[PDB]
Design a protein around this ligand. Structure first.
Ligand code: BYG
Ligand code: GSH
Lengths: 216, 217
């Protein structure tokens, strides 16, 4: 089987792990443990980092035969293409590309906050902006069952992760956006996803690394 | 014409303007000016931001007919598909994806440095790590003329922007990597590109916005 390498946390492997399960992929997981503070020892990853045949050694990584991939977006697009889970038409491709980068931007803004020493001082400034962030997403989904329309594709897995981790951060953040809330239930309702969240494989905790002020 | 909206700098628009030029695209530019410090008045952009019909108002943006795009990678990929400037085989697509994301990480790393008030003290750590970063790109390019092999694709335009601006940052950084500088020459030697670079539409400076410590100016 193929190998997914990540920290033993949720992080950037969440949507990947979900997609792998949705896709009925045969995979094992290489889980890396990071040291405590103050050092945050990374040595378990580091003995190994340049010895796996990765062009740009990074985490997450996926090995699949002669295919050795880093960058979370690339791993997603790789598994996605294998199972016809991408935007098919031109218009769908545009939305795919905009969403993948937007959600990445949203993901980073949350991490930026949760890793900064000034968490508490900067927290309210993020919560100010969050409704307006999600509003944009909600309008874009509209009445669609999925972000690219009638077809579920990979951006949905990125969407779920980003949306749901905001819900863990601010529990009522989606309440003002029914379509977003429905998207969570809909995605969590999918036969192979809810099977996997009912299993021992599943890992929603912790969100970030031991380095993070929030969710570590 | 298409409209490309961005700050009046290099920034995230470099690869885009170069790709528009290589592809003979008809385009017009809406350039926004940021105010001077300490406050960096953004009104020019901010009073127009939600009146352009964009799903996620942002800079850069492209208006092409009905098509309204933000996010620099989305814009690039949009122009690229029009002219068959994408990876074709699965291997090409994997490499294209890895690089687009990898280059963005490099890009942000330089940005994080140059926007930090502790620039001076932080500079040398970036310089120490730079050869390792450039080496990885050099090993990836190998004896290939472009990053996906035999033909140019949109990822070469990203590559060019990120590699070159590091040459602007440390002019000696590419010396140990002949393939990397040959890549730079080869790109700039492209007919439509040198013509563009000799024109007055060429905007190599300033690299970043007025908020930056390095390249602001
Ligand atoms: N990442 C997405 C969107 C990119 C994006 O964030 N957009 C910026 C213009 S990006 C800018 S200049 C600084 C921005 C000034 C305001 C703060 C930005 O929020 C350009 C280039 C950088 N570079 O080449 O390394 C750099 N590093 O840091 N800033 C930069 C912006 O002004 N947004 C309009 C708004 O917020 O209303 C993309 O790929 O398009
Ligand atoms: N932006 C990349 C990078 C992810 C990244 O920064 N990796 C972290 C974990 S989230 C890491 O531990 N990297 C390994 C390293 O630096 O050695 C991606 O999306 O996959």
């Amino acid at each position: 089987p193929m190998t997914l390498g990540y920290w033993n946390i949720r992080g950037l492997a969440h949507s990947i792990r979900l997609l792998l399960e949705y896709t009925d992929s045969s995979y094992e997981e290489k889980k890396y443990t990071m040291g405590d503070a103050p050092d945050y020892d990374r040595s378990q990853w580091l003995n190994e980092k340049f010895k796996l045949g990765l062009d740009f050694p990074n985490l997450p990584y996926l090995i699949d035969g002669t295919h050795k991939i880093t960058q979370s977006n690339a791993i997603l697009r790789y598994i996605a293409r294998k199972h016809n889970l991408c935007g098919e038409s031109e218009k769908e491709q545009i939305r795919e590309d905009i969403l993948e980068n937007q959600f990445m931007d949203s993901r980073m803004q949350l991490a930026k906050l949760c890793y900064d020493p000034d968490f508490e001082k900067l927290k309210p400034e993020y919560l100010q902006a969050l409704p307006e962030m999600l509003k944009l997403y909600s309008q874009f989904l509209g009445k669609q069952p999925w972000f690219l329309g009638d077809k579920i594709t990979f951006v949905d897995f990125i969407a779920y992760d980003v949306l749901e981790r905001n819900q863990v951060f601010e529990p009522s953040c989606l309440d003002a956006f029914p379509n977003l809330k429905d998207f969570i239930s809909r995605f969590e309702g999918l036969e192979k996803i809810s099977a996997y969240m009912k299993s021992s494989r599943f890992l929603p905790r912790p969100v970030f690394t031991k380095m993070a002020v929030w969710g570590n």
